[PDB]
């Protein structure tokens, strides 16, 4: 789950779960998912409270209740929010006063659910870089921040401490759209390349959020649709897709020293 997916979950909670007292709570007895507190203490703490707002930074979601502490969700690889089982994969479950039920599931057990006095003042949220959607860097700030990073551009975009919210599919998408190879060193990007990337990040994220992360609604010219196909059967806009991370060799070339080291 990347920024769009988590944002869609946040909006869904905001539209259907606010101002409703929590009548029942079921926190899975999962030592791997439930972090920093016991399930029983977690259940006791939030019972009877109301959700005031749903917040998000990067791929992290948290619920502001009428009194702290607040529950936070680090999705992991298979985390998801459902609003109506109680699924055997539910980790966080609450029944509201109007009968509506809210659940965070994780079949893989890689998610992290916490209960914090102030989610934003402690890790992992406190260590996150600016949100790609809510706090975008300016064109010049972006170029300046890239100038001294001797890191290949894709992994840098995946560094939540640099910019938060981008995952593998968005990374592949913005680099493909900006015509930048994923192995190009950040500090080697020209001012023009930096701006092209600044633009693609804005456009891809806004479009994805515009359609509530419904990938079936992503533009057809997006590499997203075929970035998970077997080698030799992956094409976008008629051009061959290669894998290292999906990219299009004909449209994404390596430049300078990086190209030299590659060859």
Residues 132 and 201: beta-carbon distance below 8 Å:
yes
Which two three-digit tokens encode residue 208? Answer: 């994805």
255 and 133 within one domain: yes
Whether residue 231 lies in the annotated active site: no
Of 80, 101, 127, which marks where a domain is finished? Answer: 127
Examine the domain organization and report whether 121 and 202 are in the same domain.
Answer: no
Resolution (A): 1.7
Is residue 168 within a helix (H) or strand (E), and if so which, with residue range?
Answer: helix 168-177
Examine the domain organization and report whether 2 and 92 are in the same domain: yes
Q: Which of 4, 39, 57, 59 is catalytic?
A: 59
What domain range includes position 207? 128-263
Whether 2 is catalytic: yes
In this structure, how many other beta carbons lie within 10 angstroms of the beta carbon of residue 93? 20
Residue 8: its H or E element: helix 3-16
Categorise residue 2: left if φ over 0, alpha if ψ from -120 to 50, beta otherwise. Answer: beta
Experimental approach: X-ray
Question: Is 89 labelled as part of a ligand binding site?
Answer: yes
Strand partners, 102: 83, 94
Task: Report the distance separating Cα 7 and Cα 175, nearest Å.
Answer: 22
141 and 263 both lie in a single domain: yes
Task: Give the number of domains in the chain.
Answer: 2
Question: 247 among the known binding-site residues?
Answer: no
Give the sheet arrangement for strand 112-116, strand by strand: 51-57, 60-65, 70-74, 112-116
- For residues 84 and 166, state if they share a domain: no
Are 163 and 230 within one domain? yes
Among the candidates 96, 111, 127, a domain finishes at 127
The reply, when asked if residue 31 is annotated as ligand binding, is: no
The CATH number linked to 248 is: 1.10.8.50
In a shared domain, residues 248 and 132? yes
CATH number at residue 108: 3.20.190.10
168 is in an annotated binding site: yes
Annotated active-site residue 1? The verdict is yes
């Amino acid at each position: 789950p990347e920024l769009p997916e988590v944002e869609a979950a946040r909006r869904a909670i905001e539209e259907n779960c606010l101002g409703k007292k929590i009548k029942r709570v079921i926190i899975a007895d999962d030592n791997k998912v439930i972090h920093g507190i016991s399930p029983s203490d977690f259940q006791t703490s939030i019972l009877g409270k109301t959700i005031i707002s749903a917040r998000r930074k990067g791929k992290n979601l948290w619920l502001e209740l009428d009194s702290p502490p607040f529950p936070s969700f680090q999705f992991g690889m298979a985390g998801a929010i459902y609003i109506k089982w109680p699924s055997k994969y539910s980790k966080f479950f609450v029944e509201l006063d109007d009968g509506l039920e809210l659940s965070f599931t994780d079949k893989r057990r890689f998610a992290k659910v916490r209960l914090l006095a102030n989610p934003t003042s402690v890790s992992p949220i406190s260590e996150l870089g600016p949100d790609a959607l809510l706090e975008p860097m300016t064109v010049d700030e972006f170029a300046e921040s890239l100038a001294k990073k001797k890191i290949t551009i894709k992994p840098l975009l995946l560094d939540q401490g640099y910019i938060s919210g981008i995952g593998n599919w968005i990374a592949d998408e913005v680099l493909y759209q900006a015509r930048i190879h994923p192995l190009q060193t950040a500090s080697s990007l020209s001012k023009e390349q930096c701006e092209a990337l600044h633009t693609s990040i804005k456009e891809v994220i806004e479009k994805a959020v515009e359609v509530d992360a419904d990938s079936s609604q992503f533009p057809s010219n997006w590499i997203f649709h075929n970035r998970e196909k077997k080698p030799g059967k992956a094409f976008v806009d008629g051009k061959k897709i290669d894998f290292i991370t999906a990219y299009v060799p004909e449209l994404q070339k390596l430049y300078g020293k990086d190209a030299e080291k590659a060859a």
